[PDB]
Amino acid sequence: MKGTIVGTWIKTLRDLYGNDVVDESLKSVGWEPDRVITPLEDIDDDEVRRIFAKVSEKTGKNVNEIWREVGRQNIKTFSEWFPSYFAGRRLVNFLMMMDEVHLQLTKMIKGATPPRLIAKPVAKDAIEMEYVSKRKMYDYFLGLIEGSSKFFKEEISVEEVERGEKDGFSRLKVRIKFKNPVFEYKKNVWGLVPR
Ligand code: HEM
């Protein structure tokens, strides 16, 4: 995985989740020393896998929930570190850029393997999002979405539409329903218009 994002995981992981004791043992004493790189440096793997397991072991939490919770708070952590993307959007626009954004992030960033996050309006109060990846981080994906609902303060329901595997990738499609509709029909204009 890439250096930066792994930054947040540890940040968000200690920021509010268990203490510096629970994870600073898996972290600066799981097997490794205290601190990733940051700039755009690379990192390892599968060690995130086992620190997360030892956090699940360490707290009383299934590891999938650890992941989800990270995703929730990791949206503020994201908001804190370098938040050009937040300024000026409602929830929807923000989700819909996320694909373009994950690509850009990887454009000139060799080796990067970010997910695909294709969204599509399906109703005055609903979009559909599809996560596609060789990793199956379904829980982190769900959390981010809820973490977003919280930061932008717009209530939602999320529901799984389907899931599958195609050409070696894992997919998960969800339907995100908004409390207050985010699209509208405009008079002589076809289709759901971003109200
Ligand atoms: C709601 C918004 C987001 C969702 C749903 C989301 C979802 C995800 C997921 C599930 C992963 C790892 C998935 C995989 O390939 O297994 C990922 C990784 C990452 N995300 Fe996001 N993310 C979001 C927001 C952000 C934001 C705001 C940033 C920074 C602007 C960001 C940058 C990254 C990067 C760089 C990675 C890892 C790329 C790599 O592996 O090299 N994401 N995202």
Domain that holds residue 7: 1-195
CA gap 102, 34 in Å, rounded = 28
- Tell me the best of 1, 5, 174 to mutate to test the pocket of ligand 1, counting ligand atoms within 8 Å of each CB and taking the most: 5
Cβ proximity of 172 and 138 under 8 Å: yes
Q: Which residues of 58-69 are buried (b: 16+ CB within 10 A; e: fewer)?
A: bbebebeebbbb
CATH code: domain of residue 143: 3.90.1520.10
In sequence order, what are the residues at sequence separation of 6 or more whose Cβ sits closer than 8 angstroms to the Cβ of residue 53? 63
Q: Is the CB of 119 under 6 A from ligand 1?
A: no
Q: How far is the CA of 5 from the centre of ligand 1 (A)?
A: 8
- The DSSP-derived string for 101-129 is HHHHHHTTSTT----EEEEEEEETTEEEE
What is the radius of gyration, based on Cα positions, of the chain?
18
Spell out the long-range contacts of 153-158 with Cβ–Cβ below 8 A and sequence spacing 24 or more.
154/90, 154/91, 154/178, 154/179, 154/180, 155/179, 155/180, 156/91
In sequence order, what are the residues at sequence separation of 6 or more whose Cβ sits closer than 8 angstroms to the Cβ of residue 152? 89, 90, 91, 94
Phi, psi of 145 (to 5 degrees): -50, -55
Declared resolution, Å: 2.5
The edge-to-edge listing of strands for the beta sheet with 169-178 is: 116-123, 126-133, 169-178, 156-166
- The DSSP 8-state label assigned to residue 15 in this structure reads H
Cβ proximity of 55 and 63 under 8 Å: yes
Grouping H, G, I as helix, E, B as strand and the rest as coil, residue 153 is coil
Ligand 1 atom at minimum distance from 4 CA: 35
Cβ proximity of 31 and 48 under 8 Å: no
Q: Which residues pair with 159 in a beta bridge?
A: 175
For residue 115 the two structure tokens come to: 């997910």
CA gap 16, 19 in Å, rounded = 7
Residue type at position 85: Y
Cβ proximity of 154 and 178 under 8 Å: yes
The number of folded domains in the chain is 1
Rounded to 5°, angle at Cα 46 from 41 and 50: 120
For residue 53 the two structure tokens come to: 């397991």
